[PDB]
Amino acid sequence: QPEPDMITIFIGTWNMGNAPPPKKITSWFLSKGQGKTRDDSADYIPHDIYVIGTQEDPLSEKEWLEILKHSLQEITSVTFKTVAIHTLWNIRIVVLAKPEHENRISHICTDNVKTGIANTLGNKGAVGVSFMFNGTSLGFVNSHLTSGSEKKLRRNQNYMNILRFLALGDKKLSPFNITHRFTHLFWFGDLNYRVDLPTWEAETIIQKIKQQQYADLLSHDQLLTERREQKVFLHFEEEEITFAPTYRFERLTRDKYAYTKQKATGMKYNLPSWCDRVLWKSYPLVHVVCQSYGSTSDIMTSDHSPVFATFEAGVTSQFVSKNGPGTVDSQGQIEFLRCYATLKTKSQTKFYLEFHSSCLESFVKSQEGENEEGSEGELVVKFGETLPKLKPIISDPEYLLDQHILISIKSSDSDESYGEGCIALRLEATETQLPIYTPLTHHGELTGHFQGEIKLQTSQ
Ligand SMILES: CN(C(=O)[C@H]1CCNC1)c1ccccc1
């Protein structure tokens, strides 16, 4: 029975509005409703993995698990295995997988972050799950960010706190946050970003939604504008939005947006908004295709409509050779020529590099590079031809070309990372000097760039 090179992953996000769900929610897991929907011909085909994120979830874990398992069983006639479930207050993530995947899935991690301080600590934050599917690392983050049209900055701060403090994936990757730990990272939830238009335009917005004319609304979506200005979700992808705003509805219909200020809203307007979102970030040159992104039309217990996204995702096998794991394959090497980091730091310390990859027995520290002044003020750290020769555990090109090298540039003085990035080994050629490049981030903010050449030797 051969190991897969592709799986399909269902991601759901629903703010349940502290109300029990209706008796039928199968439309959600089938990606039926508005937006980019799944073909009817696929309805009996199970996704490999279903990741369900809820907010304002009033159910016990047992109650929600029973509804989810019974739903998927009705759709697929498959009894899904529970990989993980984690709840912080009323924020929940559930991971369900086909039984055939039970022995492919390992290294299951769960965590949560509470966002804000005092007043603003008590109900917002994130839950997450990571695991290995054979040779591929998968992370999943369900976040409920700060609400309110005038708090996009708070939402961006909540995002940075979640990506700094959420403890998932391989702890040996100590310089790296969740935005570098996974082959594929999916980040979803009630992100709570609003359509930033004057309150007096509410009926005009509703009119535009009724005509399915979203272009002038999306141009004012705060998540898209903040992302454009590199304020949040730097280096993340999102499928084009082709479904109506998923908030705020009158309950028990989808015919009405409830936007007017009420005591129950803290006298705040809730203009129709795409609060409920799915984004992802995958390592360079790994296969990931969004196959659906939409909202349900027939689940009306909440003031939010459920959102679905489905993905084809590239996975690799758990590779064993005569040599690695447990030794090097001397027929493999990774060389770095003409390499330099460009940092935005105003500081003057010496810097060195750390190379982390599952293709190495352990991480590799470089010698300090040579600091030069860039023509526009920048710090340029030159490594030239001084970077070490990396010794992969396996030289088979069917393995090695599928791997990635995480790079941290660290201060000699503090041993603190100033920048993290990632290089694909999916090269156009072996035994050939080829350009490499990655942006460098720290706490998910742009801190610089790393560029140079690579020379990859495989057994072929
Ligand atoms: C131009 N653009 C991109 O290329 C995405 C996809 C790759 N990472 C960012 C973008 C950025 C922010 C908001 C909307 C679109």
Side-chain angles (χ1 to χ4, degrees), residues 2-460:
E3 289 311 296
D5 60 8
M6 214 81 97
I7 59 167
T8 67
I9 303 174
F10 177 93
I11 307 294
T13 183
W14 187 28
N15 181 322
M16 298 178 72
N18 304 113
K23 80 175 154 278
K24 182 182 201 63
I25 61 169
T26 58
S27 68
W28 191 20
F29 310 123
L30 282 180
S31 301
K32 303 302 176 80
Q34 285 176 324
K36 183 189 186 87
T37 65
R38 186 165 182 244
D39 203 83
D40 295 330
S41 68
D43 286 1
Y44 298 152
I45 302 179
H47 298 296
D48 294 288
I49 301 176
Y50 293 78
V51 188
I52 306 83
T54 52
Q55 316 86 29
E56 298 191 39
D57 180 339
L59 300 180
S60 70
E61 285 188 347
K62 164 176 185 155
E63 284 169 333
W64 189 219
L65 270 171
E66 197 184 298
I67 289 159
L68 294 173
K69 290 210 175 184
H70 284 149
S71 295
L72 292 190
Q73 191 143 77
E74 183 160 285
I75 291 163
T76 67
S77 301
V78 169
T79 299
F80 270 81
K81 298 294 187 158
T82 310
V83 172
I85 180 163
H86 191 66
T87 306
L88 165 70
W89 295 312
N90 297 106
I91 313 160
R92 178 173 291 148
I93 183 165
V94 185
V95 178
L96 299 181
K98 289 191 73 191
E100 64 199 73
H101 294 327
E102 190 179 332
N103 301 291
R104 292 180 170 127
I105 289 163
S106 66
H107 292 89
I108 301 160
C109 306
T110 67
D111 195 25
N112 64 261
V113 172
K114 307 169 197 204
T115 58
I117 49 186
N119 276 236
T120 70
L121 199 153
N123 77 281
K124 296 308 194 290
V127 294
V129 179
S130 71
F131 51 94
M132 292 294 299
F133 187 95
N134 285 335
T136 299
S137 57
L138 300 174
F140 301 95
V141 178
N142 169 34
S143 70
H144 193 181
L145 308 186
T146 299
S147 66
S149 71
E150 309 311 303
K151 297 194 174 158
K152 79 187 186 187
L153 171 60
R154 284 291 179 268
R155 291 189 268 284
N156 298 347
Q157 289 166 339
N158 293 163
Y159 165 84
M160 170 172 304
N161 283 322
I162 299 162
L163 77 84
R164 282 186 68 185
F165 298 125
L166 195 65
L168 296 176
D170 174 11
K171 303 315 182 274
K172 297 201 161 151
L173 294 180
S174 68
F176 301 104
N177 62 61
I178 53 167
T179 73
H180 286 119
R181 280 183 181 194
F182 307 105
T183 322
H184 305 281
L185 169 59
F186 296 92
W187 189 323
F188 47 95
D190 181 355
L191 310 189
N192 249 322
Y193 288 92
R194 306 310 176 88
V195 168
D196 220 349
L197 275 175
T199 305
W200 58 262
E201 291 280 60
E203 294 298 329
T204 300
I205 295 166
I206 291 169
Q207 284 206 327
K208 293 285 181 199
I209 299 166
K210 298 191 171 162
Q211 301 168 89
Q212 309 182 68
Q213 285 166 24
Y214 306 135
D216 306 330
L217 304 184
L218 289 166
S219 65
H220 295 273
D221 173 69
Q222 288 168 341
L223 185 50
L224 288 173
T225 63
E226 287 300 271
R227 279 174 27 75
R228 284 282 182 177
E229 291 180 37
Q230 291 185 26
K231 298 310 189 67
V232 84
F233 284 101
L234 182 61
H235 301 141
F236 278 76
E237 311 285 335
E238 193 189 17
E239 180 56 284
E240 182 187 352
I241 292 156
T242 66
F243 51 97
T246 57
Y247 185 70
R248 184 173 173 246
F249 291 102
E250 184 192 305
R251 294 178 196 235
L252 304 186
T253 182
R254 290 301 78 156
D255 289 346
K256 187 188 283 153
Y257 284 101
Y259 65 83
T260 205
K261 67 172 193 187
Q262 302 295 182
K263 280 190 272 176
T265 67
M267 299 302 292
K268 288 182 221 306
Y269 286 93
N270 286 297
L271 296 184
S273 292
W274 287 283
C275 285
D276 308 295
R277 310 289 273 269
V278 180
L279 298 87
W280 75 94
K281 178 186 173 180
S282 297
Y283 284 173
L285 299 181
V286 180
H287 180 87
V288 56
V289 180
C290 179
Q291 293 284 34
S292 71
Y293 195 33
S295 58
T296 63
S297 308
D298 60 339
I299 300 174
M300 294 168 297
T301 52
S302 184
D303 46 10
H304 291 249
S305 282
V307 168
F308 50 79
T310 59
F311 297 86
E312 296 184 336
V315 289
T316 60
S317 294
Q318 299 185 39
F319 220 96
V320 176
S321 81
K322 310 227 164 220
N323 300 313
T327 189
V328 295
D329 198 325
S330 58
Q331 298 157 81
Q333 50 180 92
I334 317 168
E335 295 176 284
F336 292 94
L337 290 87
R338 299 183 50 163
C339 284
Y340 65 89
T342 301
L343 296 184
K344 306 180 174 292
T345 189
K346 288 167 206 181
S347 109
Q348 272 294 349
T349 163
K350 295 193 184 159
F351 288 100
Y352 64 91
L353 297 189
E354 282 183 17
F355 301 92
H356 293 70
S357 182
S358 36
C359 84
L360 308 174
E361 289 206 291
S362 62
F363 81 84
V364 179
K365 275 152 137 68
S366 82
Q367 290 197 294
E368 295 175 320
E370 298 187 335
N371 298 351
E372 307 171 16
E373 184 79 38
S375 83
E376 278 177 290
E378 329 96 285
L379 176 58
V380 167
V381 187
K382 188 189 165 165
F383 291 100
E385 317 295 306
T386 70
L387 297 170
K389 186 190 306 191
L390 302 184
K391 294 316 194 109
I393 55 163
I394 295 162
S395 46
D396 187 337
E398 298 248 50
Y399 172 75
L400 198 48
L401 293 163
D402 280 350
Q403 310 303 312
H404 293 83
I405 309 302
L406 292 174
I407 301 192
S408 170
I409 180 153
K410 287 176 130 184
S411 157
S412 294
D413 298 347
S414 66
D415 284 321
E416 60 189 325
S417 187
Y418 276 57
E420 300 99 57
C422 182
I423 297 307
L425 297 192
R426 183 158 290 167
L427 310 182
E428 289 299 343
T430 63
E431 307 180 315
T432 309
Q433 297 166 25
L434 292 175
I436 57 168
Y437 172 74
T438 180
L440 292 182
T441 63
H442 190 64
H443 303 166
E445 284 183 332
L446 198 60
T447 58
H449 313 271
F450 179 87
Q451 60 211 280
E453 301 176 319
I454 194 159
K455 208 175 112 202
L456 180 64
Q457 201 168 125
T458 70
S459 56
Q460 287 300 104

